[PDB]
């Protein structure tokens, strides 16, 4: 879905507010190869500390499941940059999968990542998304075996998203191991969410096969620091991670 060597900015929808998220996105596009928009949820038991707090914030500031599409609808008015919507199953299962997928397709969403998709509903979900034109994005952690990575790759139409609860300040060997294993198995391109925070992390991961490097934590960190005034600090951090 994105060019090799891509830096993939991740932001939580509505942190601090929807209009502000849109501002940050339009401010990081020039560096992005793709954008990942998260939908805040009550129990983000899969995310790390920093990102869990962005959800806690978004929800505090009054967020609604459909404020995310607005962010995308408006972003499109200026960019074609592929957009992947990140979410927990709950929101989708409540509003209706096909209903949710179709609506995202209308606002401009290209693909979607469901962090905790029940294997019991994975099949139907992938088929529906396909009918609706939404490329799928599946996740894998360091405790994912080669055999599941293969199953994941065969279902994936967008790209495989490798993560690490670990954190860092260096990328843990377990995450590196996961990357190597993924490149050796996945036919789809892969992006890594290993919580980068240093220019040496980006250089190293791209060098090791990561088709794309996601950058969330390091941005959400700043966002939860400067709020609306995060913009400029976001660009300097991105440039740092680029060495520019």
Short mmCIF file of C-alpha atoms in Angstrom, two decimals:
data_model
loop_
_atom_site.label_atom_id
_atom_site.label_comp_id
_atom_site.label_asym_id
_atom_site.label_seq_id
_atom_site.Cartn_x
_atom_site.Cartn_y
_atom_site.Cartn_z
CA UNK A 1 0.00 0.00 0.00
CA UNK A 2 3.03 2.24 0.51
CA UNK A 3 6.44 2.86 -1.06
CA UNK A 4 9.45 1.00 0.29
CA UNK A 5 11.45 3.06 2.76
CA UNK A 6 8.22 4.74 3.89
CA UNK A 7 7.75 6.41 7.25
CA UNK A 8 4.16 5.74 8.35
CA UNK A 9 2.82 8.36 10.82
CA UNK A 10 0.27 7.06 13.33
CA UNK A 11 -2.11 9.32 15.24
CA UNK A 12 -5.11 8.76 17.45
CA UNK A 13 -8.33 10.24 16.11
CA UNK A 14 -9.29 13.18 18.31
CA UNK A 15 -6.11 13.94 20.27
CA UNK A 16 -6.87 16.58 21.35
CA UNK A 17 -9.71 17.08 18.85
CA UNK A 18 -10.72 15.82 15.40
CA UNK A 19 -9.92 19.16 13.75
CA UNK A 20 -6.50 19.02 15.42
CA UNK A 21 -5.78 15.50 14.17
CA UNK A 22 -6.55 16.70 10.65
CA UNK A 23 -4.10 19.56 11.19
CA UNK A 24 -1.26 17.25 12.23
CA UNK A 25 -1.90 14.85 9.32
CA UNK A 26 -1.82 17.66 6.74
CA UNK A 27 1.39 18.72 8.46
CA UNK A 28 3.17 15.36 8.19
CA UNK A 29 2.03 14.31 4.72
CA UNK A 30 5.13 15.69 3.00
CA UNK A 31 7.18 13.08 4.91
CA UNK A 32 4.67 10.23 5.03
CA UNK A 33 4.40 7.29 2.67
CA UNK A 34 1.15 6.35 4.36
CA UNK A 35 -0.94 7.37 7.37
CA UNK A 36 -2.47 5.28 10.16
CA UNK A 37 -5.46 6.67 12.06
CA UNK A 38 -6.48 5.11 15.34
CA UNK A 39 -10.00 4.91 16.71
CA UNK A 40 -9.94 5.44 20.51
CA UNK A 41 -11.52 2.61 22.52
CA UNK A 42 -12.35 1.93 26.18
CA UNK A 43 -10.10 -1.10 26.63
CA UNK A 44 -6.92 -0.79 24.52
CA UNK A 45 -5.31 -3.77 26.23
CA UNK A 46 -3.22 -4.41 23.13
CA UNK A 47 -1.50 -1.01 22.99
CA UNK A 48 1.47 0.35 24.86
CA UNK A 49 1.30 2.92 27.66
CA UNK A 50 1.61 6.08 25.55
CA UNK A 51 -0.99 5.07 22.96
CA UNK A 52 -3.41 3.89 25.64
CA UNK A 53 -3.30 7.39 27.10
CA UNK A 54 -4.09 8.92 23.70
CA UNK A 55 -7.26 6.83 23.64
CA UNK A 56 -8.04 7.84 27.23
CA UNK A 57 -7.66 11.45 26.10
CA UNK A 58 -9.63 11.27 22.86
CA UNK A 59 -12.51 9.68 24.76
CA UNK A 60 -12.27 12.32 27.49
CA UNK A 61 -12.45 15.15 24.96
CA UNK A 62 -15.63 13.56 23.65
CA UNK A 63 -15.02 11.31 20.66
CA UNK A 64 -17.51 9.33 18.58
CA UNK A 65 -16.94 6.34 16.31
CA UNK A 66 -17.88 8.40 13.24
CA UNK A 67 -15.72 11.44 13.92
CA UNK A 68 -12.87 9.41 12.42
CA UNK A 69 -14.45 9.34 8.95
CA UNK A 70 -14.71 13.14 9.07
CA UNK A 71 -10.96 13.31 9.66
CA UNK A 72 -10.45 11.14 6.57
CA UNK A 73 -13.12 12.81 4.45
CA UNK A 74 -11.44 16.18 5.01
CA UNK A 75 -7.89 14.88 4.64
CA UNK A 76 -8.73 13.54 1.18
CA UNK A 77 -9.73 17.03 0.07
CA UNK A 78 -5.98 17.63 0.02
CA UNK A 79 -4.26 14.24 -0.22
CA UNK A 80 -4.42 10.80 -1.78
CA UNK A 81 -1.91 9.34 0.69
CA UNK A 82 -3.12 5.83 1.53
CA UNK A 83 -5.01 5.76 4.82
CA UNK A 84 -5.28 2.76 7.11
CA UNK A 85 -7.89 2.86 9.85
CA UNK A 86 -6.85 1.18 13.11
CA UNK A 87 -9.42 -0.15 15.58
CA UNK A 88 -10.52 -2.77 18.08
CA UNK A 89 -13.20 -5.21 16.95
CA UNK A 90 -15.82 -3.95 19.43
CA UNK A 91 -16.69 -0.66 17.63
CA UNK A 92 -17.05 -2.49 14.32
CA UNK A 93 -19.06 -5.45 15.66
CA UNK A 94 -21.50 -3.00 17.24
CA UNK A 95 -22.21 -0.80 14.21
CA UNK A 96 -22.05 -3.67 11.74
CA UNK A 97 -18.99 -4.82 9.79
CA UNK A 98 -20.28 -4.32 6.24
CA UNK A 99 -21.91 -1.07 7.38
CA UNK A 100 -18.70 0.19 8.94
CA UNK A 101 -16.49 -0.91 6.05
CA UNK A 102 -18.69 0.69 3.38
CA UNK A 103 -18.78 3.97 5.30
CA UNK A 104 -14.99 4.08 5.66
CA UNK A 105 -14.68 3.40 1.95
CA UNK A 106 -16.85 6.48 1.28
CA UNK A 107 -14.78 8.83 3.46
CA UNK A 108 -11.61 7.72 1.69
CA UNK A 109 -10.20 4.87 3.80
CA UNK A 110 -8.02 2.49 1.77
CA UNK A 111 -7.34 -0.26 4.31
CA UNK A 112 -8.19 -1.29 7.85
CA UNK A 113 -6.44 -2.95 10.79
CA UNK A 114 -8.50 -4.74 13.42
CA UNK A 115 -6.09 -5.37 16.30
CA UNK A 116 -8.15 -8.07 18.03
CA UNK A 117 -10.17 -9.77 15.30
CA UNK A 118 -11.62 -13.06 16.63
CA UNK A 119 -10.25 -15.87 14.48
CA UNK A 120 -13.84 -17.12 14.54
CA UNK A 121 -14.92 -14.08 12.47
CA UNK A 122 -11.69 -13.44 10.54
CA UNK A 123 -12.85 -15.31 7.43
CA UNK A 124 -16.16 -13.49 6.98
CA UNK A 125 -14.53 -10.17 7.85
CA UNK A 126 -11.86 -10.47 5.15
CA UNK A 127 -14.45 -11.46 2.54
CA UNK A 128 -16.74 -8.54 3.38
CA UNK A 129 -13.93 -5.96 3.41
CA UNK A 130 -12.95 -7.28 -0.01
CA UNK A 131 -16.48 -6.84 -1.38
CA UNK A 132 -16.38 -3.32 0.06
CA UNK A 133 -12.97 -2.41 -1.34
CA UNK A 134 -11.06 -2.26 1.94
CA UNK A 135 -7.62 -3.87 1.91
CA UNK A 136 -6.92 -5.77 5.11
CA UNK A 137 -4.04 -5.23 7.52
CA UNK A 138 -3.23 -7.97 10.05
CA UNK A 139 -0.99 -7.74 13.08
CA UNK A 140 1.74 -10.00 14.44
CA UNK A 141 3.83 -9.74 17.61
CA UNK A 142 7.14 -11.36 18.59
CA UNK A 143 5.17 -14.31 20.01
CA UNK A 144 3.60 -15.13 16.65
CA UNK A 145 4.85 -18.43 15.16
CA UNK A 146 6.04 -18.84 11.55
CA UNK A 147 2.90 -20.86 10.78
CA UNK A 148 0.47 -18.12 11.87
CA UNK A 149 2.55 -15.50 10.06
CA UNK A 150 1.97 -17.54 6.91
CA UNK A 151 -1.78 -17.75 7.55
CA UNK A 152 -1.79 -14.01 8.13
CA UNK A 153 0.08 -13.33 4.90
CA UNK A 154 -2.36 -15.33 2.78
CA UNK A 155 -5.35 -13.30 4.13
CA UNK A 156 -3.66 -9.90 4.01
CA UNK A 157 -4.30 -7.61 1.04
CA UNK A 158 -2.89 -4.35 2.45
CA UNK A 159 0.24 -5.27 4.38
CA UNK A 160 1.41 -7.11 7.49
CA UNK A 161 1.84 -4.97 10.62
CA UNK A 162 4.57 -6.18 12.99
CA UNK A 163 4.52 -4.86 16.55
CA UNK A 164 6.23 -5.36 19.89
CA UNK A 165 4.67 -4.70 23.29
CA UNK A 166 8.29 -4.58 24.47
CA UNK A 167 8.90 -0.92 23.72
CA UNK A 168 12.62 -0.11 23.75
CA UNK A 169 16.21 2.84 24.34
CA UNK A 170 16.89 0.25 21.66
CA UNK A 171 14.77 -2.00 19.49
CA UNK A 172 14.62 -5.36 21.30
CA UNK A 173 16.18 -8.37 19.59
CA UNK A 174 12.82 -10.10 19.84
CA UNK A 175 11.36 -7.45 17.50
CA UNK A 176 14.32 -7.79 15.13
CA UNK A 177 13.79 -11.55 15.15
CA UNK A 178 10.13 -11.02 14.32
CA UNK A 179 11.09 -8.74 11.41
CA UNK A 180 13.56 -11.25 9.92
CA UNK A 181 11.04 -14.09 10.28
CA UNK A 182 8.35 -12.00 8.60
CA UNK A 183 10.46 -10.97 5.58
CA UNK A 184 11.45 -14.60 5.07
CA UNK A 185 7.79 -15.66 5.00
CA UNK A 186 5.48 -12.81 3.97
CA UNK A 187 4.85 -12.13 0.28
CA UNK A 188 3.01 -8.95 1.33
CA UNK A 189 5.03 -5.86 2.29
CA UNK A 190 5.48 -5.36 6.03
CA UNK A 191 5.44 -2.30 8.27
CA UNK A 192 6.87 -2.19 11.76
CA UNK A 193 5.45 -0.59 14.86
CA UNK A 194 8.34 -1.12 17.28
CA UNK A 195 7.97 2.30 18.89
CA UNK A 196 10.89 4.03 17.20
CA UNK A 197 12.30 7.18 18.79
CA UNK A 198 15.74 7.66 17.25
CA UNK A 199 17.11 8.22 13.74
CA UNK A 200 19.26 5.10 14.23
CA UNK A 201 16.11 3.00 14.68
CA UNK A 202 14.69 4.03 11.33
CA UNK A 203 17.99 3.52 9.51
CA UNK A 204 18.45 0.11 11.11
CA UNK A 205 14.93 -1.20 10.49
CA UNK A 206 14.78 -0.18 6.82
CA UNK A 207 18.19 -1.76 6.42
CA UNK A 208 16.83 -4.97 7.94
CA UNK A 209 13.90 -5.36 5.56
CA UNK A 210 11.09 -3.28 7.02
CA UNK A 211 9.25 -2.04 3.91
CA UNK A 212 7.83 0.73 6.06
CA UNK A 213 8.47 2.21 9.50
CA UNK A 214 5.50 3.30 11.59
CA UNK A 215 5.96 6.25 13.95
CA UNK A 216 3.22 6.59 16.54
CA UNK A 217 4.41 6.67 20.14
CA UNK A 218 7.04 9.33 19.46
CA UNK A 219 4.36 11.57 17.96
CA UNK A 220 1.54 10.80 20.40
CA UNK A 221 4.10 11.56 23.10
CA UNK A 222 4.53 15.08 21.79
CA UNK A 223 0.85 15.49 21.00
CA UNK A 224 0.00 14.75 24.63
CA UNK A 225 2.60 17.36 25.51
CA UNK A 226 1.74 20.34 23.30
CA UNK A 227 -1.87 19.56 22.41
CA UNK A 228 -3.09 21.77 19.57
CA UNK A 229 0.39 23.30 19.48
CA UNK A 230 1.99 19.95 18.66
CA UNK A 231 2.29 20.56 14.89
CA UNK A 232 5.77 22.11 14.67
CA UNK A 233 7.28 19.73 17.21
CA UNK A 234 5.83 16.85 15.21
CA UNK A 235 7.63 17.95 12.04
CA UNK A 236 10.97 18.40 13.79
CA UNK A 237 10.70 14.94 15.32
CA UNK A 238 9.87 13.41 11.94
CA UNK A 239 12.77 15.22 10.29
CA UNK A 240 14.99 13.98 13.12
CA UNK A 241 13.87 10.40 12.47
CA UNK A 242 14.75 11.08 8.85
CA UNK A 243 18.00 12.88 9.49
CA UNK A 244 16.95 16.09 7.76
#
